[model samples]
Target: MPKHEFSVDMTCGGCAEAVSRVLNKLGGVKYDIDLPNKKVCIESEHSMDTLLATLKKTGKTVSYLGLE
Candidate 1:
């Protein structure tokens, strides 16, 4: 179980909710989103590409920590 951190442009509760909803659909992954920090922490064995792609579906910018 690897934990990855990402920064997303989530400025409101609705943005967080949408991000949560989309990520939940991926299954086998759990997330913690902090709207104030605009950060998301994910615990999953899935590939980074998959997680990144899934998060991008939320239409918010998702950038991996320390990478982008």
Candidate 2:
């Protein structure tokens, strides 16, 4: 259960909701979207590319918080 942190360009509830909806489509992953922080915390066994692809589907900018 590795945890991944990401920063997304989410500015509103609707944007957060869209991110949620997109992430849900990928199974076997648990996530929390911190709207105020504009960040996403994911506990998953999925690959970075897999998660990245799904996140990108929302049409929002997604950045991996690598070693930060």
Residue pairs with backbone overlap in model 1:
none
Among all windows of 10 consecutive residues in model 1, the one with the lowest summed lDDT is 59-68
Angstrom error of the Cα, residue 62, model 2: value is 1.1
Tell me the whole-model lDDT of each prediction, alpha carbons only. Answer: 0.84, 0.82
Where model 1 places Cα greater than 4 Å from the true spot, the runs are: 66-68
Among residues 3 or more apart in sequence or in different chains, the pairs in candidate 2 whose N, CA or C atoms overlap within 3 Å are: none
Give me the candidate number with maximum TM-score: 1
- Tens-place lDDT per residue, model 2, 1-68, is 46788899778878888988888889887788898889898878886667888888887778887632
Expressed as tens digits, the lDDT of each residue in 1-68 for candidate 1 is 47788999888789998888999999988888899899889878786678998988987778887422
Please, what is the TM-score per model? 0.87, 0.86
Task: Score candidate 2 by TM-score against the native.
Answer: 0.86
